[PDB]
Design a protein around this ligand. Structure first.
Ligand SMILES: [Fe+3]
Length: 53
């Protein structure tokens, strides 16, 4: 599992931390995050993210 970054604000989704406050548990691969989840910092959709490396 790769990290993904919001290309609008720069937030980085790290799969080993998840986003637990919004129901995304540690270990969730980015493709498997519910498709209505948005960037915690700018509200951008998953469609604005890209793989970090
Ligand atoms: Fe963002």
């Amino acid at each position: 599992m790769k990290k993904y970054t919001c290309t609008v604000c720069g937030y980085i989704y790290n799969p080993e931390d998840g986003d637990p406050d919004n129901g995304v548990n540690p270990g969730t691969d980015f493709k498997d995050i519910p498709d209505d989840w948005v960037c915690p910092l700018c509200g951008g959709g998953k469609d604005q993210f890209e793989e970090v490396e």
